[PDB]
Each structure stands twice: as C-alpha cells, then as structure tokens.
Amino acid sequence: LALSLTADQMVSALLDAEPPILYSEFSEASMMGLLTNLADRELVHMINWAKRVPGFVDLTLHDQVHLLECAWLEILMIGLVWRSMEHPGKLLFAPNLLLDRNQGKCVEGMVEIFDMLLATSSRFRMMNLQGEEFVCLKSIILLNSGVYTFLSSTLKSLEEKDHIHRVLDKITDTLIHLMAKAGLTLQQQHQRLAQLLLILSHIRHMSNKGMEHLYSMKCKNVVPSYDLLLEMLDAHRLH
Amino acid sequence: LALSLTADQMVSALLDAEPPILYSEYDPTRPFSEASMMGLLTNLADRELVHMINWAKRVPGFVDLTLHDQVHLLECAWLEILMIGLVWRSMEHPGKLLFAPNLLLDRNQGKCVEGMVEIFDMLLATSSRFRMMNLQGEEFVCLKSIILLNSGVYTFTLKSLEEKDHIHRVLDKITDTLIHLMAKAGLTLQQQHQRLAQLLLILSHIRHMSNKGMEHLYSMKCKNVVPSYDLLLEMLDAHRLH
Numbered sequence: 001l002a003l004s005l006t007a008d009q010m011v012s013a014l015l016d017a018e019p020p021i022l023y024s025e026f027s028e029a030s031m032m033g034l035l036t037n038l039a040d041r042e043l044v045h046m047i048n049w050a051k052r053v054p055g056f057v058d059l060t061l062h063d064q065v066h067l068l069e070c071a072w073l074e075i076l077m078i079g080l081v082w083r084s085m086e087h088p089g090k091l092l093f094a095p096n097l098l099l100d101r102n103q104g105k106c107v108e109g110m111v112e113i114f115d116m117l118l119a120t121s122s123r124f125r126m127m128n129l130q131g132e133e134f135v136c137l138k139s140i141i142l143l144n145s146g147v148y149t150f151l152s153s154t155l156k157s158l159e160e161k162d163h164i165h166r167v168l169d170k171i172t173d174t175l176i177h178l179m180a181k182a183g184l185t186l187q188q189q190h191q192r193l194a195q196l197l198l199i200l201s202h203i204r205h206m207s208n209k210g211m212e213h214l215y216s217m218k219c220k221n222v223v224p225s226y227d228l229l230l231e232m233l234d235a236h237r238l239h
Numbered sequence: 240l241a242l243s244l245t246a247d248q249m250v251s252a253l254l255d256a257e258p259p260i261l262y263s264e265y266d267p268t269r270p271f272s273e274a275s276m277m278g279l280l281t282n283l284a285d286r287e288l289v290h291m292i293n294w295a296k297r298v299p300g301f302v303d304l305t306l307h308d309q310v311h312l313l314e315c316a317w318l319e320i321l322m323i324g325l326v327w328r329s330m331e332h333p334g335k336l337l338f339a340p341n342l343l344l345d346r347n348q349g350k351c352v353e354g355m356v357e358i359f360d361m362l363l364a365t366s367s368r369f370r371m372m373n374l375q376g377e378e379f380v381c382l383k384s385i386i387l388l389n390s391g392v393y394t395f396t397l398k399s400l401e402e403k404d405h406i407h408r409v410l411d412k413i414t415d416t417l418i419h420l421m422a423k424a425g426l427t428l429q430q431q432h433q434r435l436a437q438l439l440l441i442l443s444h445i446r447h448m449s450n451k452g453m454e455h456l457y458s459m460k461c462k463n464v465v466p467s468y469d470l471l472l473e474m475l476d477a478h479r480l481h
C-alpha cells in the first residue's frame with residue numbers, strides 16, 4: 001500500500017501524521033528537568049507519528065524499535081529547529097519555553113548544542129524550508145538513520161532493507177514533485193534536494209553531540225530503552 | 240574559476256586530485272602480534288592526513304576560501320574523509336577493511352581494542368551498501384568533495400556569508416556533476432534523483448561513524464585525538480605574501 005501512494009498522497013499522509021505542539025511543565029537542575037520532561041512527552045507522540053509514516057508498520061517490531069532507537073534525538077531536534085525557524089536567535093522548545101544561547105550556559109555542553117541548533121534554524125530560514133519539505137525530511141531521518149546498523153544479514157533483514165529503500169525512493173520522488181510544483185527548474189530541483197539532504201548529516205552530528213553530553217551528566221535513564229520503545233510500539237488491538 | 244568549470248572538467252579535476260594509496264609501516268618479517276593494532280591505525284591516519292590536505296587544495300573552489308575557513312572544514316571532515324576512503328578501498332573485499340594493501344582486516348581483528356568492533360561493523364555495512372549500489376569512482380570523488388565542503392559549513396560580518404555562499408555554489412556544481420554522470424550512464428530522470436538521494440543519505444551514516452570513532456578515541460586517552468588548528472594550517476603551506 002505504501003509503495004502504491006502517489007506523491008500528493010505521500011505529502012497528505014505525512015501532513016496528517018504530524019504530532020501536536022506541546023507545552024512545557026532557570027538553574028542547571030530546573031531547565032534540564034523541563035527539557036527532559038518535554039522530550040519524554042514528545043517521544044510518546046513521536047511513536048504514534050512513526051506508525052503513520054507510510055511503510056513503517058510494514059516492518060518487524062524489532063526493526064521499528066531499532067529505527068526509533070537510532071533516530072529519536074535527530075527527530076526531536078529537526079522538530080525543534082522547524083518550530084524555531086521564524087524566531088531568529090531563539091529555540092522554541094515550546095510556545096511557553098523560548099530559550100536563547102545564554103540560557104544554554106546553565107548546563108554542561110548545552111551552549112555548543114544550542115549554537116548548532118540555532119545555525120540549523122538559520123539554514124532552514126535561508127532556504128525558506130516549506131512545511132511539506134520538513135515532513136519529508138523528518139520521515140527520511142526515521143527510515144534512514146538506523147537502516148545501516150541492522151547487521152543481522154538474515155533473509156528477513158534483506159527484505160526489510162529493500163522495503164526501507166523503496167519507501168525512501170518514494171519520499172525522494174515526493175520531494176522532487178513538491179519542488180517541481182513550486183516552479184523550480186530541473187537543475188534547481190536537484191540542487192535543492194541535495195541541499196536538504198546534506199542538512200541531515202548536520203542533524204546526525206547534533207544528535208551524537210547531544211547524546212554524548214547527556215551520558216557525561218550520568219543520570220539513570222539516558223536513552224529510551226529497547227523495552228520502553230517496544231512497550232509503546234508493541235500495541236495490542238484492544239482499543 | 241571553479242564555478243566556471245563544466246561537469247566533465249569538475250570530474251577530471253577530482254580524479255586528478257586523488258591521493259595515493261599508502262602502506263602500513265610495520266616489519267612484515269616480525270610476529271605482528273608484537274605490533275600495536277592501534278599504533279598501526281594511528282600512524283596510517285596521520286600519514287593519510289598529509290595527503291588529504293594536498294587533495295583538499297585541488298578540490299575546485301576550496302583555495303578560494305580564507306585559510307581559517309579551510310582549516311575549519313578540514314578540522315570537521317578529516318575522519319569522515321579517511322572513512323569514506325577506507326570504505327571505497329574495501330568495496331571489492333566483502334567482510335574485510337582494506338586499511339592498506341598490506342593491512343586487510345576482518346571484524347574479529349577489531350576485538351583487540353575498546354569500541355573498535357562496533358566501528359568496524361558500521362564501516363563494513365557501508366562498504367556493503369557501496370557494493371549494492373555499484374558506486375562508481377567518479378561518484379566517490381564527488382561524495383568525498385561534498386564531505387569536505389559540507390561537514391563544517393554549519394559551524395562557521397559579510398565575509399562569512401560570502402564564504403558560506405561560495406561553499407554552497409561549489410556544492411551545487413558538484414550536485415550538477417553527479418547528475419551529469421548519472422545522465423551519461425543512461426539513468427532516467429527519476430533514477431538520477433533517486434540515486435543522488437541514496438548517495439547523499441549515506442553521508443549521514445559516515446558522519447555517525449566519524450562521531451562514534453572520535454568518541455572512542457577520546458575515551459582512550461589518545462594523544463592528539465584531533466589534528467590541531469596549527470598542524471592543519473602548517474600542512475596547508477600558506478603563500479608567503481601576507
């Protein structure tokens with residue numbers, strides 16, 4: 001069904017899948033508390049969003065967990081950068097939690113992360129990133145980030161990787177369709193596609209940097225565990 | 240001059256710029272159990288870095304940037320560049336990493352030191368992906384040039400905007416070059432945009448491996464984990480007219 005979707009149907013499915021914008025609730029302890037709680041509430045909606053990305057639920061639950069374990073922070077960050085796009089010099093964590101780089105000084109390594117996120121928001125603003133492009137990029141992160149670390153090389157894993165690459169190809173077709181509809185020339189379409197996909201390497205960089213600093217802080221729960229993600233993804237049919 | 244190059248001239252300039260394949264420095268008459276695997280890899284990386292700076296200077300548009308910006312791009316991309324090179328050399332050696340013609344290692348050989356088997360598995364999966372895609376040498380040189388220009392552009396006055404604009408124009412030329420190569424190979428327009436995306440998404444995995452590699456080098460208390468600004472600036476061999 002996912003591979004049968006047209007570019008317009010892909011765009012519509014992604015726009016419809018969008019999670020809501022949540023609200024929050026400034027010492028090292030206070031701001032971290034608000035950020036941790038916000039990340040945890042957004043994670044719940046991210047799992048529901050992932051289930052609505054065409055082709056995602058066709059995967060095994062172990063592969064769905066793997067993709068989310070790899071991409072959760074990149075997904076939170078691209079969302080954050082998108083919400084912050086029209087707020088130069090600020091990160092819109094929530095409508096009631098708009099922070100600047102100085103507010104990042106409160107926690108270890110947080111300013112470096114804030115500066116990288118603010119530069120990404122600036123880049124989105126410079127490119128005049130559209131909402132329809134944003135939902136395609138966020139879906140790409142979900143399907144791409146973890147596809148290279150399945151490693152089992154089982155016949156099932158080969159079938160899963162082929163499926164992921166076919167869905168990713170449909171998303172590329174969708175991105176090109178959007179650019180063609182916006183009146184870009186073929187040359188401009190290929191150049192913009194590359195510009196958008198290269199920002200994903202910076203998003204990966206920030207996610208790794210963020211995770212490194214989260215571990216340096218040494219808390220009990222750092223990453224959503226396999227079991228926690230499976231618990232949320234491993235739904236029953238009784239509702 | 241760089242922005243005036245045709246797609247064919249860009250391809251030729253990149254192929255001509257290619258650094259040499261180096262050999263690992265060890266006594267091949269000795270047991271090698273007596274060779275530090277970390278020592279061999281560190282020495283090889285250090286040797287390759289010198290040739291990487293020479294190569295970077297031959298990437299069209301790179302030397303038009305300020306020296307401070309050239310150093311920043313290399314500080315950001317050096318490990319990703321070593322890794323893409325490694326994955327390319329290993330492409331036709333399933334299950335092995337061709338560090339050098341005399342240093343072909345498997346995943347078990349990564350069990351020697353902390354976090355290396357994880358890095359080896361990720362690199363082997365990338366080689367496998369290149370093999371599946373039948374990556375061409377002309378595409379590889381474009382991707383390696385992209386890593387150099389893209390990796391540090393996000394972590395950079397009107398000169399800075401001009402510097403970023405120049406980098407993005409060179410990156411656009413490389414995208415045009417990759418599309419040209421695919422069009423010449425007989426791919427349809429749809430296949431061209433799909434393959435361009437597939438190649439650029441692998442760069443996110445290359446960034447991931449570079450970050451994981453550096454994290455493990457910092458965990459071991461490795462001397463000079465990263466090339467210093469001064470070392471890179473020295474290797475760039477600045478003109479003497481400033």
Ligand SMILES: O=C(O)c1ccc2c(c1)CCCC(c1ccc(Cl)cc1Cl)=C2c1ccc(O[C@H]2CCN(CCCF)C2)cc1
Nearest residue numbers: 035036038039042076080109110210213214221222223224
């Ligand atoms: O846009 C969002 O909703 C959003 C929310 C929180 C964050 C971010 C985006 C990314 C940038 C800032 C940031 C952070 C701040 C400081 C440092 Cl050094 C590192 C990072 Cl990445 C976090 C964070 C903060 C805490 C955090 O903790 C959670 C990680 C997963 N949770 C535990 C597992 C589930 F039980 C706790 C996750 C992200």
Ligand SMILES: O=C(O)c1ccc2c(c1)CCCC(c1ccc(Cl)cc1Cl)=C2c1ccc(O[C@H]2CCN(CCCF)C2)cc1
Nearest residue numbers: 280281283284287321325354355452455456463464465466
């Ligand atoms: O394809 C090459 O020539 C090539 C050479 C060495 C490496 C790689 C490719 C990448 C994979 C394996 C690897 C590594 C092995 C183990 C661990 Cl935990 C992490 C990594 Cl990334 C290194 C490495 C090893 C050491 C190393 O040392 C640095 C410390 C001193 N140097 C930088 C400062 C002077 F410039 C280099 C750099 C890369």
